[PDB]
Amino acid sequence: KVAYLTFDDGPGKYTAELLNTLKQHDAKATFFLIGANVKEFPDLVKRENAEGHYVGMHSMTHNFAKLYKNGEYVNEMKEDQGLIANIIGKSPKLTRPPYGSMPGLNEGLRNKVVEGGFKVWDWTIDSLDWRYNKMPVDAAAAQIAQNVLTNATKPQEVILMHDIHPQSVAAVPAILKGLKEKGYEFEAYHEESHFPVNFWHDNRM
Amino acid sequence: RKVAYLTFDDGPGKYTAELLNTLKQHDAKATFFLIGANVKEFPDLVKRENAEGHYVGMHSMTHNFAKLYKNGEYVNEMKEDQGLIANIIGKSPKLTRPPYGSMPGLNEGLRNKVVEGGFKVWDWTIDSLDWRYNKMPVDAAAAQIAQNVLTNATKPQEVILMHDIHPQSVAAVPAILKGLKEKGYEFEAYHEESHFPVNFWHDNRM
Amino acid sequence: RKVAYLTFDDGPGKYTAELLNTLKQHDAKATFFLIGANVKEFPDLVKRENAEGHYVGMHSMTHNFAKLYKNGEYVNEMKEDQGLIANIIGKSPKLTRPPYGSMPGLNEGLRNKVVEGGFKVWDWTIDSLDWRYNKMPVDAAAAQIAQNVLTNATKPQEVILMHDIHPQSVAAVPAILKGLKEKGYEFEAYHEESHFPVNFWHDNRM
Amino acid sequence: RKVAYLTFDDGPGKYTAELLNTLKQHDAKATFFLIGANVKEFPDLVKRENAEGHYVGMHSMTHNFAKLYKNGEYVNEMKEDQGLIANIIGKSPKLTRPPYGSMPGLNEGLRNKVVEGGFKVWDWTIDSLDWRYNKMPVDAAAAQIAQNVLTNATKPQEVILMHDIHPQSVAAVPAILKGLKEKGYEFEAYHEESHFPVNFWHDNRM
Ligand SMILES: O=C(CCc1cccc2ccccc12)NO
Ligand SMILES: O=C(CCc1cccc2ccccc12)NO
Ligand SMILES: [Zn+2]
Ligand SMILES: [Zn+2]
Ligand SMILES: [Zn+2]
């Protein structure tokens, strides 16, 4: 059993704390980074690759109408890939759609994505970490732990978290314990290891 | 403990009272987001939905995207809907449900006004797609609609998008109610005191 | 108790009286769905059809697919068809037969109005395919349409689409009464108190 | 005596060679109605559809209802689309498939020009409705499309309407080929030598 923790919308203030927590539990994870945050936190970006984590994209504007209704998705992932390449010196292919691929990644755009070289990944478990924004972090974290452990049943699992949130980062510790108790490994995504995990079941992606 | 919130949008309508009886029969409670033009045409049926233990929420006056979001009459229209619903059931509900969902019409500004007015906002986590099955035998459409809802009910809470203004939709509720509780779901209404957020913007003030 | 319901569309017409003779000779009862201008020009055949044990229902005014379905006049056209028939047989019949069938032009709204206006709607289970054989040698065409109808007759109830304005169809009404009875079928008209649904939408209110 | 005529409209498309392989794998033949703009963009697939034993007929050039029917460019467009297809496969095919169906666009005027210009016109007797399942998981859209086509194949001949320009559609033809075969169907292409009419106007001239 393998457990792929993914974190969206970063890097951020607590990314550095989260990276320590991972280092200490010998855990590897996956990071979908927004363009403007790689422009601001190059060292975090460079550290994430350096310490054995996948670093994928999550676009430039994280804006629903621009990506999907005006069809800018692939364009802003390519740009995002460019910026990330200017740090880690390789061009990652895996993408994570803002707000998921259903239903905004229509058949025309999923063609552009397969064409452009990119993969798409959604998630299996929504930590629901955004529910507990701005409440007591200790308890807020304990509950997001509960949510994901409660839903860890499958051989492979992909978990949506956000490392721009204190609550979510605070509870990575409990998740790592509960999941490795349940017999899970904690690996990052890799491009030859790629099997499809997308809401459309489009296995080209 | 799983619970499934059946929501029914754009009503009341001509199939609503039958919906109200299939609910009643499996001791199942649900949630109704109404349009004000149909608050005024079918007042007995709002009165009744409420009197049978269902949440009655707003879903605007016009249901017109340009007027709601581009012109920002969202909170205006959900307050007007509020008014009419209250004069019938004697209480001003607070939950709304955006025509065509919150994303991307309910910009940050309108989201601030929504919060400023006491309203909450609900989208959904399963989209039955019921209204897209209007070109087939009704028996067959209901069964695919049910397949849709059943194979996506996987989380402890699910908020299932339907419309009680289409026959294929109300036809599917029987099979939906049998399948979900075989899966271990109970069918509750939205309780105002027990609000937890469900929006596409991940905004937990709503 | 196999029951076979012979249906004849778009009449009355010049070969109708020949059909009415052939039916009475086999003491067979059928159903006729008539167009309004054929009722205005053949009142005698209409009066006769009812008189010899046949149900007389409607097939609308214009048989025009745009007007009926896309412009929503179906029920309005079946109503004026019903008056014209009511002025001859002194009944106001309920059963309608949609031109080009229920699907898909009889949308969820029209089916509300049909239910609201008193009407039932009936399609068929057997398409004689008599229209393929137009303006071809009548005997050969006839023996051919019989093969079509004979071969697909298989369940306890059957409703058979035929046209009494076409010669090859009426010519094959003897060869159909032969083998269908052989297979154990009785030939009745549609009786309104015996209404069950036979429509492509499986909409049971009609 | 059971034949199923698989038609595919609006191609060739990006999923069409996939589809072309799946047909080869079951040694099953089918019919393709092509928009001229895709004839020009995917010419290798045109002569490849033909070279593998499939009928290549015309959809239109514009797939524009107003120009095709209101302005009456139907035959003009079929003839131009004809030339393109000929320049690739050396045949001047004669069968046409009307965009949005012959009903109600092909009026008696246009149907006259069709008949005088040598052309044939085919509608269909099953409408998979595949192109509407664009908002769901693709595998589940295939299955509901397969259920649709499987459960309506009852007549000796059946003309199945799909579009090879949607992933969900091609993804469904595996299940479709398996199910119809069990139900006793052979999978043949349209042969001009053995033409029989299939239109909504019931016009056996075309
Ligand atoms: O107004 C509404 C939403 C309706 C609705 C139904 C199905 C799919 C949708 C996709 C996007 C937006 C709205 C959708 N309910 O009343
Ligand atoms: O030409 C076609 C049309 C099929 C079809 C039939 C009826 C309504 C439609 C509406 C939108 C699109 C296609 C429609 N197939 O290629
Ligand atoms: Zn995000
Ligand atoms: Zn007719
Ligand atoms: Zn088309």
Short mmCIF file of N, CA, C and O in Angstrom, two decimals, chain B residues 156-204:
data_model
loop_
_atom_site.label_atom_id
_atom_site.label_comp_id
_atom_site.label_asym_id
_atom_site.label_seq_id
_atom_site.Cartn_x
_atom_site.Cartn_y
_atom_site.Cartn_z
N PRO B 156 -18.66 10.58 3.94
CA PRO B 156 -19.63 10.54 5.04
C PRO B 156 -20.80 11.48 4.84
O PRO B 156 -21.95 11.10 5.07
N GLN B 157 -20.54 12.71 4.42
CA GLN B 157 -21.59 13.61 3.97
C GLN B 157 -21.54 13.72 2.45
O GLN B 157 -20.46 13.80 1.86
N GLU B 158 -22.73 13.70 1.83
CA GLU B 158 -22.90 13.96 0.41
C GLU B 158 -24.07 14.91 0.23
O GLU B 158 -25.08 14.79 0.93
N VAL B 159 -23.92 15.86 -0.68
CA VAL B 159 -24.98 16.82 -0.95
C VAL B 159 -25.33 16.66 -2.43
O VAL B 159 -24.55 17.04 -3.31
N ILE B 160 -26.50 16.09 -2.69
CA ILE B 160 -26.83 15.55 -4.00
C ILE B 160 -27.74 16.54 -4.73
O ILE B 160 -28.85 16.84 -4.27
N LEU B 161 -27.27 17.04 -5.88
CA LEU B 161 -27.99 18.03 -6.67
C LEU B 161 -29.10 17.37 -7.48
O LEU B 161 -28.81 16.50 -8.31
N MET B 162 -30.36 17.75 -7.25
CA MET B 162 -31.44 17.37 -8.15
C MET B 162 -32.40 18.54 -8.36
O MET B 162 -32.26 19.62 -7.77
N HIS B 163 -33.37 18.30 -9.25
CA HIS B 163 -34.40 19.27 -9.63
C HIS B 163 -35.75 18.56 -9.58
O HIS B 163 -35.92 17.51 -10.21
N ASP B 164 -36.69 19.11 -8.82
CA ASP B 164 -38.01 18.51 -8.72
C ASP B 164 -38.97 19.07 -9.76
O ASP B 164 -40.19 18.91 -9.63
N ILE B 165 -38.44 19.69 -10.80
CA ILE B 165 -39.27 20.24 -11.84
C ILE B 165 -39.18 19.42 -13.14
O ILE B 165 -39.69 19.83 -14.18
N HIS B 166 -38.62 18.20 -13.06
CA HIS B 166 -38.49 17.28 -14.19
C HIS B 166 -38.98 15.90 -13.78
O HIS B 166 -38.57 15.38 -12.73
N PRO B 167 -39.83 15.26 -14.59
CA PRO B 167 -40.34 13.94 -14.21
C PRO B 167 -39.26 12.88 -14.02
O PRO B 167 -39.36 12.09 -13.07
N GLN B 168 -38.22 12.85 -14.86
CA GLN B 168 -37.18 11.82 -14.74
C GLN B 168 -36.47 11.90 -13.40
O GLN B 168 -35.89 10.90 -12.95
N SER B 169 -36.53 13.07 -12.75
CA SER B 169 -35.78 13.34 -11.53
C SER B 169 -36.49 12.71 -10.34
O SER B 169 -35.93 11.85 -9.65
N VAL B 170 -37.75 13.10 -10.12
CA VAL B 170 -38.61 12.53 -9.08
C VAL B 170 -38.78 11.03 -9.26
O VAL B 170 -38.99 10.32 -8.27
N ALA B 171 -38.70 10.53 -10.50
CA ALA B 171 -38.78 9.09 -10.77
C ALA B 171 -37.59 8.33 -10.21
O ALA B 171 -37.69 7.12 -9.97
N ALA B 172 -36.44 9.00 -10.05
CA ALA B 172 -35.20 8.37 -9.62
C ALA B 172 -35.06 8.35 -8.11
O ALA B 172 -34.34 7.49 -7.58
N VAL B 173 -35.74 9.26 -7.42
CA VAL B 173 -35.63 9.35 -5.96
C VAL B 173 -35.95 8.01 -5.28
O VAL B 173 -35.27 7.67 -4.30
N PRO B 174 -36.96 7.25 -5.70
CA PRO B 174 -37.15 5.93 -5.08
C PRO B 174 -35.89 5.07 -5.10
O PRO B 174 -35.41 4.65 -4.04
N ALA B 175 -35.33 4.82 -6.28
CA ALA B 175 -34.14 3.99 -6.37
C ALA B 175 -32.95 4.62 -5.65
O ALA B 175 -32.09 3.91 -5.12
N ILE B 176 -32.87 5.96 -5.64
CA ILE B 176 -31.79 6.63 -4.91
C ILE B 176 -31.91 6.37 -3.41
O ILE B 176 -30.91 6.11 -2.73
N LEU B 177 -33.14 6.45 -2.88
CA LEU B 177 -33.35 6.27 -1.45
C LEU B 177 -33.06 4.84 -1.02
O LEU B 177 -32.57 4.61 0.09
N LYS B 178 -33.36 3.87 -1.89
CA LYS B 178 -33.11 2.47 -1.55
C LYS B 178 -31.62 2.16 -1.60
O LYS B 178 -31.10 1.43 -0.75
N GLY B 179 -30.92 2.71 -2.60
CA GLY B 179 -29.51 2.39 -2.75
C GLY B 179 -28.65 3.04 -1.69
O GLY B 179 -27.78 2.39 -1.11
N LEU B 180 -28.89 4.32 -1.42
CA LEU B 180 -28.02 5.03 -0.50
C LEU B 180 -28.10 4.44 0.90
O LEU B 180 -27.07 4.30 1.58
N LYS B 181 -29.30 4.08 1.37
CA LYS B 181 -29.34 3.56 2.73
C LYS B 181 -28.95 2.09 2.80
O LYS B 181 -28.57 1.62 3.87
N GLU B 182 -29.01 1.36 1.68
CA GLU B 182 -28.27 0.10 1.61
C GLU B 182 -26.79 0.34 1.86
O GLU B 182 -26.12 -0.47 2.51
N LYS B 183 -26.27 1.45 1.35
CA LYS B 183 -24.88 1.85 1.56
C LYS B 183 -24.64 2.46 2.92
O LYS B 183 -23.50 2.80 3.24
N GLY B 184 -25.68 2.64 3.73
CA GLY B 184 -25.51 3.18 5.06
C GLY B 184 -25.67 4.68 5.19
O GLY B 184 -25.04 5.28 6.07
N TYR B 185 -26.51 5.29 4.36
CA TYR B 185 -26.80 6.71 4.46
C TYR B 185 -28.16 6.94 5.09
O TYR B 185 -29.10 6.16 4.86
N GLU B 186 -28.28 8.00 5.87
CA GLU B 186 -29.57 8.53 6.29
C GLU B 186 -29.85 9.83 5.55
O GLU B 186 -28.94 10.52 5.08
N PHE B 187 -31.13 10.15 5.43
CA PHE B 187 -31.60 11.21 4.54
C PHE B 187 -32.15 12.33 5.41
O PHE B 187 -33.34 12.34 5.75
N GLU B 188 -31.29 13.27 5.74
CA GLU B 188 -31.69 14.38 6.57
C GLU B 188 -31.77 15.67 5.77
O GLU B 188 -31.21 15.80 4.67
N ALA B 189 -32.54 16.60 6.34
CA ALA B 189 -32.60 17.95 5.84
C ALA B 189 -31.39 18.71 6.34
O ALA B 189 -30.67 18.26 7.24
N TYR B 190 -31.16 19.87 5.73
CA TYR B 190 -30.20 20.83 6.26
C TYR B 190 -30.77 21.42 7.55
O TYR B 190 -31.87 21.97 7.53
N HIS B 191 -30.06 21.26 8.67
CA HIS B 191 -30.43 21.92 9.91
C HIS B 191 -29.63 23.19 10.04
O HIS B 191 -28.40 23.17 9.93
N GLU B 192 -30.34 24.30 10.25
CA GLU B 192 -29.69 25.60 10.24
C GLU B 192 -28.68 25.72 11.37
O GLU B 192 -27.61 26.32 11.20
N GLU B 193 -29.00 25.16 12.53
CA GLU B 193 -28.11 25.27 13.68
C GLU B 193 -26.83 24.46 13.49
O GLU B 193 -25.81 24.77 14.11
N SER B 194 -26.85 23.44 12.63
CA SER B 194 -25.74 22.52 12.44
C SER B 194 -25.00 22.75 11.13
O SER B 194 -24.60 21.80 10.45
N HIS B 195 -24.78 24.01 10.75
CA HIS B 195 -24.28 24.31 9.41
C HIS B 195 -22.78 24.01 9.32
O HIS B 195 -22.00 24.45 10.16
N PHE B 196 -22.40 23.26 8.27
CA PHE B 196 -21.04 23.05 7.83
C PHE B 196 -20.92 23.43 6.36
O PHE B 196 -21.83 23.15 5.58
N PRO B 197 -19.80 24.05 5.94
CA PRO B 197 -19.77 24.70 4.62
C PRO B 197 -19.66 23.70 3.49
O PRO B 197 -19.03 22.64 3.60
N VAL B 198 -20.27 24.05 2.37
CA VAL B 198 -20.18 23.26 1.15
C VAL B 198 -20.22 24.25 0.01
O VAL B 198 -21.30 24.58 -0.50
N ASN B 199 -19.07 24.76 -0.40
CA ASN B 199 -19.07 25.69 -1.51
C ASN B 199 -17.87 25.39 -2.40
O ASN B 199 -16.87 24.81 -1.97
N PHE B 200 -17.99 25.79 -3.66
CA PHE B 200 -16.90 25.56 -4.60
C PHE B 200 -15.71 26.47 -4.34
O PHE B 200 -14.60 26.17 -4.81
N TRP B 201 -15.90 27.57 -3.61
CA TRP B 201 -14.82 28.51 -3.35
C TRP B 201 -14.00 28.13 -2.14
O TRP B 201 -12.99 28.79 -1.87
N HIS B 202 -14.41 27.09 -1.41
CA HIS B 202 -13.75 26.66 -0.17
C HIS B 202 -13.80 27.74 0.91
O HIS B 202 -12.96 27.79 1.80
N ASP B 203 -14.81 28.61 0.84
CA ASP B 203 -14.99 29.73 1.75
C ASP B 203 -15.84 29.28 2.94
O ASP B 203 -17.04 29.01 2.77
N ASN B 204 -15.25 29.23 4.13
CA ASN B 204 -15.92 28.66 5.29
C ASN B 204 -16.61 29.70 6.16
O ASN B 204 -17.05 29.38 7.27
#
